[PDB]
Amino acid sequence: GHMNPEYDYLFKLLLIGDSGVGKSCLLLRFADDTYTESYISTIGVDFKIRTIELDGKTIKLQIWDTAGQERFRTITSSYYRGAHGIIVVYDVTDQESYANVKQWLQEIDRYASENVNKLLVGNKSDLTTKKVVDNTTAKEFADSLGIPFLETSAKNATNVEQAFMTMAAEIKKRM
Amino acid sequence: GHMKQEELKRLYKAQAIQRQLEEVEERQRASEIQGVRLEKALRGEQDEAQLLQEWFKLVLEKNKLMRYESELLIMAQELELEDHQSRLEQKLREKMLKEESQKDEKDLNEEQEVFTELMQVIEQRDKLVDSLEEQRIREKAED
Ligand SMILES: Nc1nc2c(ncn2[C@@H]2O[C@H](COP(=O)(O)OP(=O)(O)NP(=O)(O)O)[C@@H](O)[C@H]2O)c(=O)[nH]1
Ligand SMILES: [Mg+2]
């Protein structure tokens, strides 16, 4: 916590999506490189900070984690407006969470800035035998929207770093 | 488990900030003493060109120590907000595990209060990020 800041850009990111899809674990894996099997539902909101490097630019990411339960929708909606980028997370083993992605996209249109960047993430790719959302259908949806799409595992860390880097590069190009 | 490790890491890092701070304030104590010894010597109570070179370095050093102390104070503040947030969260999680039947009207009032303090601490952490950013923008504009 300096007086003279050694970063070039500050990007504010937001994680949204159904409860239990792994939003908090993705943040924990990215910001702290750890992982808990405990299901500790998020109370309203929280954020962590991680600094990254992109084309010679040092970029501070402020990443907001939100409760997915509908019950918290009023509380979490205040936080959409200031986001540079919003990541919508679903669970590849959970068909209904993918189904709800259309709803989460409408929450973004209602509450976020007009030009906010968006990224679609299917989490829990480690659960091989339990996967039910074909990445073909997810990818083809994302593409019809001009949205980038990635599958991740917060548990074994696959693609987690790449997900946030991809989001940051999209913002940088825009901003 | 996961929560204990996080607490341990937080505690070690507060402790280490505190250590650096303690050393800085000691060096500030010593530099101030050297400061009056130099004044006395220049005022006539070795070589005075040499004293002046010493006085010059003391001035630079007081500035260095000041900027170091101020950086550490901000870090310590940031860490206390995080520690405060964590205890609020655990206090709230515990109240919530209490089943609703035995839940007195004063319990509901305390949940609301703990929740309010938790969101305010989070808001203080966020405004600290926004303050740093403002400062970045100003320094860039000055230079
Ligand atoms: N196998 C596997 N389990 C995961 C993965 N990510 C999260 N989980 C598990 O799924 C559960 C939900 O985690 P969590 O991150 O809390 O979900 P959430 O989206 O934050 N929920 P909420 O919105 O209520 O706070 C936890 O038991 C967690 O360990 C993953 O990549 N693989
Ligand atoms: Mg969560």
Author numbering:
A (entry chain B): -1 to 173
B (entry chain A): 531 to 575, 581 to 678
Please give the exact wording used by the authors of the publication that reports this structure.
One such family of effector proteins that was reported to link Rab proteins and the cytoskeleton is the Mical (molecules interacting with CasL) family.
Well diffracting crystals were found using the RBD of Mical-cL (residues 534–683) in complex with different Rab proteins (Rab1, Rab8 and Rab10). In all structures (Rab1:Mical-cL, Rab8:Mical-cL and Rab10:Mical-cL) we found one Rab protein bound to one molecule of Mical-cL, in agreement with the previous observations that all Rab proteins tested bind only one site in Mical-cL. Most interactions were visible between the Rab proteins and α-helix 3 of Mical-cL with some additional contributing residues from α-helix 2, forming extensive contacts involving residues within switch I and II of the Rab proteins. Since the interacting residues in the RabSF1 and RabSF2 regions are strongly conserved between both Rab1 and Rab8 families, this did not explain the observed preference of the RBD towards the Rab8 family. However, we observed that the main chain atoms of the N-terminal residues preceding the RabSF1 motif can be traced in the electron density and seem to interact with amino acids within α-helix 1 and 2 of Mical-cL, even though the electron density in this region did not allow a precise localization of the side chains. Interestingly, whereas Rab1 contains a glutamate near the N-terminus (Glu4), all Rab8 family members contain one or (in the case of Rab10) two lysine residues in this region that point towards a negatively charged patch in Mical-cL. Using Mical-cL as one representative of the bMERB family, we saw that all members of the Rab8 family bound Mical-cL with high nanomolar affinities, compared to Rab1 (KD = 5.2 µM) and Rab35 (KD = 1.8 µM).
